[PDB]
Amino acid sequence: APKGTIYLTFDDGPINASIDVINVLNEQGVKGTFYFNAWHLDGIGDENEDRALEALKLALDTGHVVANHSYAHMVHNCVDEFGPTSGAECNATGDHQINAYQDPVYDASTFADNLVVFERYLPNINSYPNYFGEELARLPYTNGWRITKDFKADGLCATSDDLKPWEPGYVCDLDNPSNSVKASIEVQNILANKGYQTHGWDVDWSPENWGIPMPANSLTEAEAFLGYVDAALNSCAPTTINPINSKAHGFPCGTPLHADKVVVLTHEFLYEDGKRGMGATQNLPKLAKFLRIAKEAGYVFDTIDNYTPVWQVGNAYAAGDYVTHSGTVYKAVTAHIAQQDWAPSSTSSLWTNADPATNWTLNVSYEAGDVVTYQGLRYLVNVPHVSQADWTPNTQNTLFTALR
Ligand code: NA
Ligand code: NA
Ligand SMILES: [Zn+2]
What kind and span of H or E run contains 20?
helix 16-27
Distance CA 333, CA 322 (A): 10
Ligand 1 centre to CA of 336 (Å) is: 24
Between the CA of 328 and the centroid of ligand 2 the distance, in Å, is 5
Q: 69 a known binding residue?
A: yes
Backbone angles phi, psi at 289, to 5 degrees: -70, -50
Q: Is 327 annotated as a binding residue?
A: yes
Is 159 annotated to bind ligand? yes
Topology of the domain covering 316-402: Seminal Fluid Protein  PDC-109 (Domain B) (2.10.10)
b/e map of 128-159 (b: 16 or more CB within 10 Å)? bebbbbbbbbbbbbbbbbbbbbebbbbbbbbb
Q: Which residues of 287-300 are buried (b: 16+ CB within 10 A; e: fewer)?
A: bbebbeebbeeebe
54 is in an annotated binding site: no
- Half-sphere exposure for 97 (CA within 13 Å, toward CB): 20
Q: Are 9 and 265 in contact (CB under 8 A)?
A: yes
Determine how β-strand 4-11 pairs with β-strand 33-36: parallel
Q: Is 12 annotated as a binding residue?
A: yes
Phi, psi (5° rounding) for residue 213? -60, -35
Is 220 among the annotated ligand-binding positions? no
Method used to determine the 3D structure:
X-ray
CA of 327 to the centre of ligand 2 (A): 4
Ligand nearest to the CA of 132: 1
Q: In the CATH hierarchy, which fold is given to the domain comprising 4-306?
A: TIM Barrel (3.20.20)
Q: Using CA atoms, how far apart are residues 390 and 348, in angstroms rounded to an integer?
A: 15
Question: What angle (nearest 5°) sits at the alpha carbon of residue 81, between those of residues 78 and 85?
Answer: 80
Q: How many whole angstroms from 291 Cα to the centroid of ligand 1?
A: 30
DSSP line for 75-112: GGGGSSS--TTHHHHHHHHT-TTBT----HHHHHHHHH
126 CA → ligand 1 middle, Å: 10
φ, ψ dihedrals at 347, nearest 5°: -120, 0
Per DSSP, what are the bridge partners of residue 283?
none
Task: Please tell me whether 260 is known to bind a ligand.
Answer: no
CA 200 – CA 138 distance, rounded (Å): 7
Terminal C-alpha separation, the chain: 53
Nearest ligand to the CA of 195 is: 2
Ligand 1 midpoint to CA 123 (Å): 17
Cα of 273 from ligand 3 centre, angstroms: 19
Q: 366: helix, coil or strand?
A: strand
Pairing assessment for the beta strands 328-332 and 351-353 based on DSSP bridges: antiparallel
User: Cα–chain-centroid distance for residue 17?
Assistant: 21
Strand, helix or coil for residue 199: coil
Question: Is 33:303 a contact under the CB 8 Å cutoff?
Answer: yes
Return the ligand number nearest the Cα of 143: 3
CA–CA distance, 133 with 119 (Å, rounded to integer):
10
Ligand 2 center–CA 194 separation, angstroms: 8
CA dist., res. 123 & res. 10, Å (int): 23
> 361 Cβ partners below 8 Å, 6+ apart?
353, 355, 372, 387
Query: CA-CA distance, 263 to 250, in Å (whole number)?
Result: 17
User: Which three-class secondary structure state does DSSP give residue 286?
Assistant: helix
Ligand 1 centre distance from Cα of residue 69 (Å)? 18
From the CA of 200, the nearest ligand is 3
Give the separation between CA 141 and CA 220, rounded to whole angstroms: 20
Domain ranges of the chain: 4-306, 316-402
Radius of gyration of the chain (CA): 21
Ligand nearest to the CA of 70: 3
Q: How far is CA 53 from CA 13, 16, 28, 36, 145, in A?
A: 10, 9, 23, 11, 29
**Ligand positioned closest to the Cα atom of 326:** 1
To 5 degrees, how large is the angle CA 54–CA 57–CA 63?
A: 140
Q: Please give the distance, rounded to the nearest whole angstrom, from the Cα atom of residue 327 to the centre of ligand 1.
A: 5
Cβ contact 137:67 at 8 Å:
yes
**134 Cβ neighbours under 8 A, 6+ residues apart:** 68, 115, 195, 196, 327
**Phi-psi region at 189: left, alpha or beta (left = phi > 0; alpha = psi -120 to 50):** alpha
| CA 37 / ligand 3 centre spacing (Å) | 8
How many whole angstroms from 13 Cα to the centroid of ligand 2? 22
CA of 311 from ligand 2 middle (Å) equals 13
Task: Compute, in angstroms, the gap from residue 195 CA to the centroid of ligand 2.
Answer: 4
Per-residue exposure over 172-184, b if at least 16 CB sit within 10 Å of its own CB, e if not: beeeebbebbbbb
Asked, as a colleague might, if the bond just before 243 is cis with ω within 30 of 0, I would say yes
* Distance between Cα 36 and ligand 3 center (Å): 8
